[PDB]
């Protein structure tokens, strides 16, 4: 005969019960703007790299000093 408390509470409840809507709204929306940094993890990477390769390590001494021998 009506639209009621009973039905309004039904709608309210259903809203509360729907996990898909609210969880998707929070998680999927927040998922997209996720990331911006010059990561320190990559600072580690870079530093290690610096330590990594003979072309820096040996050559820095050997090209520089064996220039002048005598």
């Amino acid at each position: 005969x009506x639209x009621x408390x009973x039905x309004x509470x039904x709608x309210x409840x259903x809203x509360x019960x729907x996990x898909x809507x609210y969880x998707x709204x929070x998680x999927x929306x927040x998922x997209x703007x996720x990331x911006x940094x010059x990561x320190x993890x990559x600072x580690x990477x870079x530093x290690x790299x610096x330590x990594x390769x003979x072309x820096x390590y040996x050559x820095x001494x050997x090209x520089x000093x064996x220039x002048x021998x005598x």
Partner: protein, 186 residues
């Protein structure tokens, strides 16, 4: 006072006073550094590691090898090694002794000049000498003439020595030492 000798024949590194039968202890001349973010905040970060300490610690450390082909690659690293060796093993101060240096023969002057420059300046040390392997090899083996083959960690040698003299033209010098062989092994 008393007199002290470093062996820098490559591989583990050998140091000891005159007249002891054998050096006090010996170290690879590995050098190594961290590879990973340091994530125990409780840990003290030390950024470079050497010697059996490293030999234990190795896994996250990664190695640099400061002597190629008997030629010592990176001076300041050597200086780290050297300082460590004196203080940690030797409990010795640079003033304390003459010090004797051990050299691949027939190799670039630079090792001579910087080695001496550093060790007289950075260390301050009563007396210095650098000596060619074969001479020692004879003295220990006690035959005044000879020819020596010694293929160490580093560059591999032929020297005939006659009694009391050098034949520097005679001499052959080769980068064939066991390290490169080992890398062939893989």
């Amino acid at each position: 006072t008393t007199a002290l000798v470093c062996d820098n024949g490559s591989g583990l590194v050998k140091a000891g006073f005159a007249g002891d039968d054998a050096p006090r202890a010996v170290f690879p001349s590995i050098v190594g550094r961290p590879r990973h973010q340091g994530v125990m905040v409780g840990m003290g970060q030390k950024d470079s590691y050497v010697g059996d300490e490293a030999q234990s610690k190795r896994g996250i450390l990664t190695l640099k090898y400061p002597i190629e082909h008997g030629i010592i690659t990176n001076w300041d690293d050597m200086e780290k090694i050297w300082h460590h060796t004196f203080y940690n093993e030797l409990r010795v101060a640079p003033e304390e002794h003459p010090t004797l240096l051990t050299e691949a023969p027939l190799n670039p002057k630079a090792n001579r000049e910087k080695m001496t420059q550093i060790m007289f300046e950075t260390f301050n040390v009563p007396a210095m000498y650098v000596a060619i392997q074969a001479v020692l090899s004879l003295y220990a083996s006690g035959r005044t003439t000879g020819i020596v083959l010694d293929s160490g960690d580093g560059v591999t040698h032929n020297v005939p020595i006659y009694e009391g003299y050098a034949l520097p033209h005679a001499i052959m010098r080769l980068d064939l030492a066991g390290r490169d062989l080992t890398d062939y092994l893989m």
